[PDB]
A paper describes a structure:
Using a high-throughput, single-cell, screening methodology, we were able to recover a panel of 52 tau antibodies from the memory B cell compartment of healthy individuals between the ages of 18 and 66. Crystal structures of both CBTAU-7.1 and CBTAU-22.1 revealed multiple positively charged arginine and lysine residues in the combining sites that are likely to be important for the recognition of the phosphate groups in the phosphorylated peptide epitopes in tau, as in other structurally characterized anti-tau antibodies such as pT231/pS235_1 with phosphorylated peptide pT231/pS235, RB86 with phosphorylated peptide (416–430) and AT8 with phosphorylated peptide (202–209).
For CBTAU-7.1, the framework and all CDR loops can be fully modeled into the high-quality electron density map. The CBTAU-7.1 combining site is lined mostly by hydrophilic and aromatic residues. Basic residues are prevalent in and around the antibody binding site: Arg96 from light chain (Kabat numbering) and Arg50 from heavy chain are in the combining site and Arg94 and Arg96 from heavy chain line the rim of the presumed binding pocket. These positively charged residues create basic electrostatic pockets on the antibody surface that could play an important role in the phosphopeptide recognition. Antibody CBTAU-7.1 was mapped exclusively to the same peptide region as AT8, but its affinity for the doubly phosphorylated peptide at positions S202 and T205 was much lower than that of AT8 (5.8 µM vs 87.5 nM). However, binding of CBTAU-7.1 appeared to be more promiscuous involving not only phospho-residues on positions S202 and T205, but also combinations of S198 + S202, S198 + T205, S199 + T205, and possibly Y197 + T205. In particular, CBTAU-7.1 appears to be more promiscuous with respect to the exact residues that need to be phosphorylated and may thus recognize a wider spectrum of phosphorylated tau species. CBTAU-7.1 showed staining of neurofibrillary tangles, pretangles, neuritic plaques and neuropil threads that was comparable to AT8.
Residue numbers in the entry:
A (entry chain L): 1 to 27, 27A, 28 to 214
B (entry chain H): 1 to 52, 52A, 53 to 82, 82A, 82B, 82C, 83 to 100, 100A, ...
The structure:
């Protein structure tokens, strides 16, 4: 079948700037049956463009599609924070109606250091035999951040997992949680639990900690 | 206005069968070709099937042909996708969609998640991430740890929806136990703790689990 190749895979641009997205097809796409879609996190895809160049209803004018045979282009000219999305092209001349693999658009903002919070396991959880310790990095930019867990000063590895939010649609920041999982018994063997955070926006590492069972 | 709402998402064993539905409104249903389009987790979009206006004729993607059955009832304004002999690679969000021209899709439903796995369904435990008037500035933070459930998804709201600003509900991660886990957190005023009540509402429909947890400063 037809293969649709998008480029770049990744784009990161400031508001006000212009984004130029490419779709190349492995066959001539007859008439101009090429569509573009926008997909925001946790949302269904939303149609931007059909007929290569015709804007779908309710779509702002700063989205414009061009191209003709194998080469196509989506131009987004005055980026807003809300434009963070994955953008897909789509051929609909022939079954299967093939999509490209997407260009992921991040929109830049100024550097922002995370606010860091640490949470001890609840007494309820402990009663069930495990302890989760949660470290929260809130509303930071850029996405890169480093979290290191210490238990009585010993560096942990392999017993934590991270999760990162998608870029926030209005302030363009990320948040991150790191969760340390121990057995109840292991948790009760140690006193000081600490989360050490490194980020471009912090001039030095931030440590948040507590002593097991104090407050 | 034009809306499409899928139903019937959930867990199914490999080799199993599952039927999806879609209710349609806001337009003349029998005047449009309709499709299913799916999206595996973290992947791109894949067209699944197509039905003509009257329900008599269907086209299927190759990987699906012979196993899926796409039907429509123009009296009930309802689409059905009978899926059979399901496989792991069928795990995806399935979007009900309306076809235009030779096949672009100008309207999409919210989508229904189908998870093909030989595991069994399990509801989350919900634990408080208590705020401290002490160890907290920048000013306060609290949350719920929503742990050990299967499959995706869960919904978390706060105060039955009254609290939305400053809320972050993290993408779930698969734990080495094969069970998912996530936290939902919110930043709140230090002054208001004690006076204000914070409750997280967790819904996990595949297991029929609804939990409310009140989250409070410890003493």
């Amino acid at each position: 079948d037809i293969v649709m190749t998008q480029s770049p895979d990744t784009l990161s641009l400031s508001p006000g700037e212009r984004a130029t997205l490419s779709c190349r097809a492995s066959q001539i796409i007859s008439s101009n049956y090429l569509a573009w879609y926008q997909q925001q996190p946790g949302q269904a895809p939303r149609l931007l463009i059909y007929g290569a160049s015709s804007r779908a209803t309710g779509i702002p004018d700063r989205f414009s599609g061009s191209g003709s045979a194998t080469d196509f282009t989506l131009t987004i000219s005055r980026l807003e924070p809300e434009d963070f999305a994955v953008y897909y092209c789509q051929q609909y001349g022939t079954s299967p109606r093939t999509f490209g693999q997407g260009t992921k658009l991040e929109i830049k903002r100024t550097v922002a250091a995370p606010s860091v919070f640490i949470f001890p396991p609840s007494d309820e959880q402990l009663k069930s035999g495990t302890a989760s310790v949660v470290c929260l990095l809130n509303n930071f930019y850029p996405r890169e951040a480093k979290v290191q867990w210490k238990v009585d000063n010993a560096l942990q590895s392999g017993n934590s997992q991270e999760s990162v939010t998608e870029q926030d649609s209005k302030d363009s920041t990320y948040s991150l949680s790191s969760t340390l999982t121990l057995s109840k018994a292991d948790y009760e063997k140690h006193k000081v639990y600490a989360c050490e955070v490194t980020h471009q926006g912090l001039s030095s590492p931030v440590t948040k900690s507590f002593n097991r069972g104090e407050c | 206005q034009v809306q499409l709402v899928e139903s019937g998402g959930g867990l199914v064993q490999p080799g199993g069968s599952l039927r999806l539905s879609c209710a349609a409104s806001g337009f003349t249903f029998s005047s449009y070709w309709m499709h299913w389009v799916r999206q595996a987790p973290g992947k791109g979009l894949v067209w699944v099937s197509r039905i003509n206006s009257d329900g008599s004729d269907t086209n299927y993607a190759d990987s699906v042909k012979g196993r899926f059955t796409f039907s429509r009832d123009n009296a009930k304004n309802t689409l059905y996708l009978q899926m059979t002999s399901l496989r792991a690679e069928d795990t995806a969000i399935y979007y009900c969609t309306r076809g235009r021209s030779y096949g672009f899709f100008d309207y999409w439903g919210q989508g229904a998640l189908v998870t093909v796995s030989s595991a069994s369904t399990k509801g989350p435990s919900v634990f408080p991430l208590a705020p401290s008037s002490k160890s907290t500035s920048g000013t306060a933070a609290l949350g719920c740890l929503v742990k050990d459930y299967f499959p995706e998804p869960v919904t978390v709201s706060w105060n039955s929806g009254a609290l939305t600003s400053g809320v972050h509900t993290f993408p779930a991660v698969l734990q080495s136990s094969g069970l998912y886990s996530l936290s939902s957190v919110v930043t709140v005023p230090s002054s208001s703790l004690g006076t204000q009540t914070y409750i997280c509402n967790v819904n996990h429909k595949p297991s029929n689990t609804k939990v409310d947890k009140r989250v409070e400063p410890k003493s």
